[PDB]
Amino acid sequence: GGGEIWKLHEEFLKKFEELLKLHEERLKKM
Amino acid sequence: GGGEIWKLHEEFLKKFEELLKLHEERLKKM
Amino acid sequence: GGGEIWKLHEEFLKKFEELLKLHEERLKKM
Amino acid sequence: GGGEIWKLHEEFLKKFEELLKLHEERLKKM
Numbered sequence: 648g649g650g651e652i653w654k655l656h657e658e659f660l661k662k663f664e665e666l667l668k669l670h671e672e673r674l675k676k677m
Numbered sequence: 678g679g680g681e682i683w684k685l686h687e688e689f690l691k692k693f694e695e696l697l698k699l700h701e702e703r704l705k706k707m
Numbered sequence: 708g709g710g711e712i713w714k715l716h717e718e719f720l721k722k723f724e725e726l727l728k729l730h731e732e733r734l735k736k737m
Numbered sequence: 738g739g740g741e742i743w744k745l746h747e748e749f750l751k752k753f754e755e756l757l758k759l760h761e762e763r764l765k766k767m
């Protein structure tokens with residue numbers, strides 16, 4: 648039910664934050 | 678699924694939009 | 708950098724928001 | 738200049754689409 652759905656979203660939320668964080672990171676290193 | 682699972686999907690798209698605006702802010706100042 | 712590089716940043720945040728809405732659409736129908 | 742910035746953004750735009758695409762993929766397999 649929502650339990651699995653929640654975990655799946657929490658997982659990609661985290662991935663997406665890593666992606667953003669990575670983006671601005673390289674944007675500086677540049 | 679049913680409109681129940683939808684509340685969950687909406688809940689996170691909202692957190693997604695939040696991350697994006699913060700990201701925009703960081704770039705702006707950057 | 709200067710407001711020139713800003714045009715670029717804005718250009719892609721816009722494409723980012725576009726991907727998100729499409730994603731919302733898919734989930735909605737899903 | 739904008740050339741590098743552009744490529745960097747095009748790179749994460751692509752990554753972000755893979756992420757979204759992956760998300761809805763697992764959302765179905767569920």
Ligand SMILES: [Hg+2]
Pocket residue numbers: 656659689690730760
């Ligand atoms: Hg999502």
Ligand SMILES: [Hg+2]
Pocket residue numbers: 670719720746749
């Ligand atoms: Hg970006």
